[PDB]
Design a protein around this ligand. Structure first.
Ligand code: ZN
Ligand code: ZN
Ligand code: ZN
Ligand code: ZN
Lengths: 200, 200, 200, 200
DNA sequence: GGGCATGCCTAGGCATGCC
DNA sequence: GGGCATGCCTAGGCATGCC
């Protein structure tokens, strides 16, 4: 169905200098997850690990949370809630934690929460923010996308954005970043195709 | 789910000399329904008209009915009921007569009945047999197939057979014929490919 | 654990001329199921369809059943019950019909029964025998093998035989045949290797 | 299952100047335990003795303990508790002291304790710290690793770190060090392979 | 229709156990 | 200990949708 609103996608580093980082995976045909700096776009396979690094200039307070939400990138689809297709919704692949209709999961976090917003109807997945150890320089979260961009009755070949927000314990906004996502069978092939088309 | 049984597919012309016939459509691009005599296989597009001719040596009694049912061709899948995938099942394309989950519809017949067999769980579509119209030596029935062979969560790229039975009143068997079906985007392309592969 | 007995493996065509047949699949590196006439040995992948044909000279009575049981081929292992390994036993792959510890499953048959013999401790899977369609010449049963021959804590790289018995309603021996089985990742590779080694 | 937390792996020599040392074993393939300074990685065979030296600049107080814990090295697996596979868990190889599911054991110490943390669900093995024997400069602990890195349903080919912590009698941190571990059939072969690949 | 768009299968060859 | 035994991963390439 449709949402009454559209989540802001404006980059906002905020007080803590919140930025995203991504691994340097190349574009081998079927690399599981690869990020394009040129496009600010992640290309990844269904249900595979997608590492996203959280960078901050200073450490946010305890109780700070990290939320991920997908929206359609094209303005005419923006009000449509991004959700899994009827087939994948029904298949038996829930990890015991995630609701069957949620596109975005976090893997390997017992404290994960899945929200179905009563007012906006938007799905999101939230985990507590954890600083890195004083040595290490960033915190990595591992997302799984549970449909292909092409799934009929679902994203139906429409591009999406993932919006990552840093929130305090009440859910107030601390920072925001985003990136485009294509979930597909051949991330390396598809990334090189879209990068080539930039020259066209 | 699974059926307790598998419908017989044995050709049986019976007392009335029941045979099927098909149009001579070629193998072009744009072609919505084309039949391969070499493969005894119909290639057609989703929700497009598929004419099947009923030929008989003599006219069956009034009350005679014509039933169509799909089964998976591969033996290991035979017990699985052929049905629409979750996406097409949910989309809003019912013609007001056909249940949403039935793969096979008859178009242009007010006296069409759709059965969901309580014992076998098989879907089928039945119309009254009408002797041929003045000038024709055959009665034509127009079927529509409402999922592609490739629909995930549905036929999922498994070939099917359509079994056409000539039945009497009680439902007893007067005759039987069958043909393979591929529902696909490019029937002409795919027909020529499979015919070529016959030489391989 | 150990069984008190060892099932006979003697070929016995019996009154009905019971024989097995197998498809002509080649030795492509990772063909899913391929049979070696030279070795009387099936090579197949885990959980993949393995067609076995039942041939008879004349039709056994209604109520006749077909049973499959694995035993270790090497004499010193013969008394050890063939079962799934601890890992596969625990994984969530049951089809709703087969107990988790059974190596051998039948796919696509609602009337399948799984037995855990109270006296011998042997596992077996049984289905009703169904004659061929009026035209057809044999009956095909589709087995799945749910561990690799190499599974540690399970078959642990020991070869097995599958024993197929034709039985009456009561369990009385009507006929018996058998074949060796290797469940492996690359059936074609492994079949060619063992066939080559015959010359060594 | 998953842990709610991830143990810190930051090196911390602390007040007592806590360091690890390892023997100079070469890579004669057969070798049962060999350490790579280039990789800070131990390569060892299942259940074989793995000497780890504890070095300190000054002697920690009586009641000081030494704890070992494994975690997955890859960030996406970090929250998954490292444990033995289902096969090795079930086999009859307990030394009378170690629980069957613990990956890491200490050999030759009657005062060994095995902990299954109620809050984190992590396994660990702890012994009292003993200053070196007179004439020795370090204290050697002998660990055994009870699965191969490749065990299916266990580590499943994922690299692990062993974290060695010096803690006081309350469990408070006095010092910490770590090393990567590969448990495998051919330590010398595999060490040379990974060292060679450093140049690639 | 002719060109893509885009998922699925599999042969090759690497990873890794075994005696 | 070198020679295999054997499962896993994925780039090549086809299957099949789309307009
Ligand atoms: Zn989907
Ligand atoms: Zn469909
Ligand atoms: Zn197994
Ligand atoms: Zn193990």
């Amino acid at each position: 169905p449709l949402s009454s609103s559209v989540p802001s996608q404006k980059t906002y580093q905020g007080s803590y200098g919140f930025r995203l980082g991504f691994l340097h995976s190349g574009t081998a045909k079927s690399v599981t997850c690869t990020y394009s700096p040129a496009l600010n776009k992640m290309f990844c396979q269904l249900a595979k690990t997608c590492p996203v690094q959280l960078w901050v200039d200073s450490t946010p307070p305890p109780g700070t949370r990290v939320r991920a939400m997908a929206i359609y990138k094209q303005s005419q689809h923006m009000t449509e809630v991004v959700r899994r297709c009827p087939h994948h919704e029904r298949c038996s692949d829930s990890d015991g934690l995630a609701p069957p209709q949620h596109l975005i999961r976090v893997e390997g976090n017992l404290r994960v929460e899945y929200l179905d917003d009563r007012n906006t109807f938007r799905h999101s997945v939230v985990v507590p923010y954890e600083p890195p150890e004083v040595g290490s320089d960033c915190t990595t979260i591992h997302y799984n996308y549970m449909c292909n961009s092409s799934c009929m009755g679902g994203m139906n070949r429409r591009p999406i954005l993932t919006i990552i927000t840093l929130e305090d314990s009440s859910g107030n906004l601390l920072g925001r970043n985003s990136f485009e996502v294509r979930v597909c069978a051949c991330p390396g092939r598809d990334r090189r195709t879209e990068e080539e088309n930039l020259r066209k």
